[PDB]
Amino acid sequence: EKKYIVALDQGTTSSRAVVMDHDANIISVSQREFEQIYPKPGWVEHDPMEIWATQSWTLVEVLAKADISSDQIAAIGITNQRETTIVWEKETGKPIYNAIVWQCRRTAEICEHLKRDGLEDYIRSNTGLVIDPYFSGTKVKWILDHVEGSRERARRGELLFGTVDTWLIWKMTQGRVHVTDYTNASRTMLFNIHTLDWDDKMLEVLDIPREMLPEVRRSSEVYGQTNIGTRIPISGIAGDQQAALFGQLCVKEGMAKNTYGTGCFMLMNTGEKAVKSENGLLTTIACGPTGEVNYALEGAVFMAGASIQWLRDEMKLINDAYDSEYFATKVQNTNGVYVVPAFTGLGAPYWDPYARGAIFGLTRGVNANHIIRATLESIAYQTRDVLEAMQADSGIRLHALRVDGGAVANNFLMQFQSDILGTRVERPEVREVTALGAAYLAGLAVGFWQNLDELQEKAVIEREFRPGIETTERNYRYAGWKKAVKRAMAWEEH
């Protein structure tokens, strides 16, 4: 009877929805883009509704657009953008403010405070995190002490708090269930990860009512029913990253994917143990082969695809991300030019909130082409950067990096990236790797699948890139690249 599953994806810039057969084949897609709100510089918001509305659309458009009825899909997997915070009136069921995205650097001040009172090691140690406006902790607060009743209503459990997923659910289930998953939970910088629970330290340190917090659940389990009509299940929950990780099947120690989207996220499986980063990476919760807590080593990069949109949208040196390859090849090389994408400051490994984007090594004969390719190169550099750590923290040698994401399409890229890592690179057959998880995980959760090995087939690698440049070559470049970064760091006056 029920021949399908539905992956729901809430992303930084658009809501998506996906259907697949039991052979795990992408039955179809729905996709509505929503408004990137930049209240001011460094700031980002979204319309929690906007987010919502889109997505729901999405969901439906599919049904119909393929003519599947509620009676044929098993359940609902679910993924999302990750740091992005929400709070709302529950009775009312209304937001008392937009959402603030992980992107947003509005919560820098705070960080500083925390900073001084040496809570690094507590945070770093009970969250695998670090101090940064990246994680909600701070955000939430921001609001709290930005809103009037807030803290009260909050306290009197009047107000609610969620995460893209969190929020998402409340909706579906009509305010019935108030949960999250660990992967997601993790993220907040208010949760104990070898504890698997909210964390008084923070909680109070950050000054937040234990009230508005959701019931943090497993990532592959049954949370509730949705009457889309006809009650559909929701047995999926992981942040998109986790999601792609799982969807990329990295589901056992030393398994790692590098994702290439708005920014870059290379995650690594420690399966059962949380390892601590010595080199400015992140320790984070993940999905084990059944929807169960795992650990992971994460390197997060702020600017990746974005550099390219900039390039196209604000710079206008191009019309198409696509185009970037054509031009890049147009030139033999980058002509000594280096580009640092700290539009948002830095990040793994660096975590320099004062770094700004910078262009380097300009000469008279340098042109847009050069600029453009340097921009791309910029992206492998980073990936390496971080990977180094990962090795350093991992105590592991990857001979193959398996990628995924928007840009994995760019062959130039791909190639270059390999040439630079010195490692071989695996470009999978399927591409919606993320949803892939969400879906799985969910269906797995329903014994829609008994095993992963099933789906293990949809993990065909389509292209592996082999390193084709000399070692010299390699470090040659990497050098000037660091040269740069240094010069980029600490731009913003304190």
Shortest separation between residue 348's beta carbon and ligand ACP, angstroms: 16
406 is in an annotated binding site: yes
* CA–CA gap between residue 182 and residue 250 (Å, rounded): 17
Residues 151/144, Cβ–Cβ less than 8 Å: yes
Shortest separation between residue 252's beta carbon and ligand ACP, angstroms: 24
Comparison of 121 and 314: residue with beta carbon closer to a copy of itself: 314
14 is in an annotated binding site: yes
* 11 contributes a contact to Mg ion by CB under 5 A: yes
381 is in an annotated binding site: no
283 is in an annotated binding site: no
Work out the angle at residue 84's Cα, subtended by the Cα atoms of residues 81 and 88, and round it to the nearest 5 degrees: 125
* CA–CA gap between residue 235 and residue 225 (Å, rounded): 9
98 in helix, strand or coil? coil
Q: How far is CA 280 from CA 47, 130, 132, 335, 400, in A?
A: 32, 8, 12, 31, 22
Shortest separation between residue 364's beta carbon and ligand ACP, angstroms: 12
* 437 contributes a contact to Mg ion by CB under 5 A: no
Comparison of 252 and 431: residue with beta carbon closer to ligand ACP: 431
442 in helix, strand or coil? helix
Judged by beta carbon distances under 5 to 8 A according to partner kind, the member of a copy of itself, Mg ion, ligand ACP, none in contact with residue 324 is ligand ACP
Comparison of 209 and 305: residue with beta carbon closer to ligand ACP: 305
Shortest separation between residue 412's beta carbon and ligand ACP, angstroms: 8
Strand duo 256-260 + 400-404: pairing:
parallel
Comparison of 1 and 314: residue with beta carbon closer to a copy of itself: 314
Q: How far is CA 238 from CA 256, 366, 370, 421, 436, in A?
A: 16, 44, 39, 29, 11
Shortest separation between residue 490's beta carbon and a copy of itself, angstroms: 10
**Site of tokens 């986790």:** 242
Give the contacts of 314 (CB within 8 A, at least 6 positions apart). none
* 288 contributes a contact to Mg ion by CB under 5 A: no
Comparison of 268 and 488: residue with beta carbon closer to a copy of itself: 488
* CA–CA gap between residue 475 and residue 486 (Å, rounded): 17
Comparison of 77 and 288: residue with beta carbon closer to ligand ACP: 77
223 is in an annotated binding site: no
The beta strand positions in 205-308, using DSSP E, are 215-217, 224-227, 231-234, 238-239, 256-260, 264-271, 282-288, 292-301
Judged by beta carbon distances under 5 to 8 A according to partner kind, the member of a copy of itself, ligand ACP, Mg ion, none in contact with residue 315 is a copy of itself
Judged by beta carbon distances under 5 to 8 A according to partner kind, the member of ligand ACP, a copy of itself, Mg ion, none in contact with residue 321 is ligand ACP
410 is in an annotated binding site: yes
Breaks in the chain follow which residues, C to N over 2.5 Å? 229
70 is in an annotated binding site: no
* CA–CA gap between residue 393 and residue 282 (Å, rounded): 10
Strand duo 73-80 + 238-239: pairing:
parallel
Q: Where are the alpha helices (DSSP H) in 38-191?
A: 48-66, 108-116, 120-126, 136-144, 151-155, 164-172, 182-187
Comparison of 240 and 377: residue with beta carbon closer to Mg ion: 240
The span of 3-11, 23-31, 319-327, 480-488 binding Mg ion (CB under 5 A) equals 3-11
16 is in an annotated binding site: yes
Shortest separation between residue 33's beta carbon and ligand ACP, angstroms: 9
- Provide the residue type at 389 as one letter: A
- Provide the residue type at 441 as one letter: L
Q: Which residues pair with 188 in a beta bridge?
A: none
Shortest separation between residue 118's beta carbon and Mg ion, angstroms: 35
Rounded to 5 degrees, what are φ and ψ at 411?
A: -70, -40
Judged by beta carbon distances under 5 to 8 A according to partner kind, the member of a copy of itself, ligand ACP, Mg ion, none in contact with residue 482 is none
Shortest separation between residue 239's beta carbon and Mg ion, angstroms: 9
218 is in an annotated binding site: no
Contacting residues toward a copy of itself, per CB under 8 A? 36, 38, 41-42, 44, 306, 310, 314-316, 335-336, 342-344, 356-368, 371, 480, 483, 487-488, 491-493
Shortest separation between residue 363's beta carbon and a copy of itself, angstroms: 5
Looking at residues 213 to 272 of the shown chain, list those that interact with Mg ion (rule: CB under 5 A).
240
Contacting residues toward ligand ACP, per CB under 6 A? 11-14, 81, 261-262, 305-306, 308-309, 321-322, 324-325, 405-407, 409-410
* CA–CA gap between residue 55 and residue 31 (Å, rounded): 8
Taking the CB of residue 231, how many other CB atoms lie within 10 A of it?
10
Judged by beta carbon distances under 5 to 8 A according to partner kind, the member of Mg ion, a copy of itself, ligand ACP, none in contact with residue 368 is a copy of itself
Give the contacts of 394 (CB within 8 A, at least 6 positions apart). 254, 268, 275, 297
Judged by beta carbon distances under 5 to 8 A according to partner kind, the member of a copy of itself, ligand ACP, Mg ion, none in contact with residue 219 is none
Residues in binding site for ADP: 12, 16, 262, 305, 406, 410
Residues in binding site for sn-glycerol 3-phosphate: 12, 82-83, 134, 240
Residues in binding site for ATP: 12-14, 262, 305, 309, 406
Residues in binding site: 12-14, 16, 82-83, 134, 231, 240-241, 262, 305, 309, 406, 410, 473
Residues in binding site for beta-D-fructose 1,6-bisphosphate: 231
Q: Which residues bind Mg ion (CB under 5 A)?
A: 11, 240
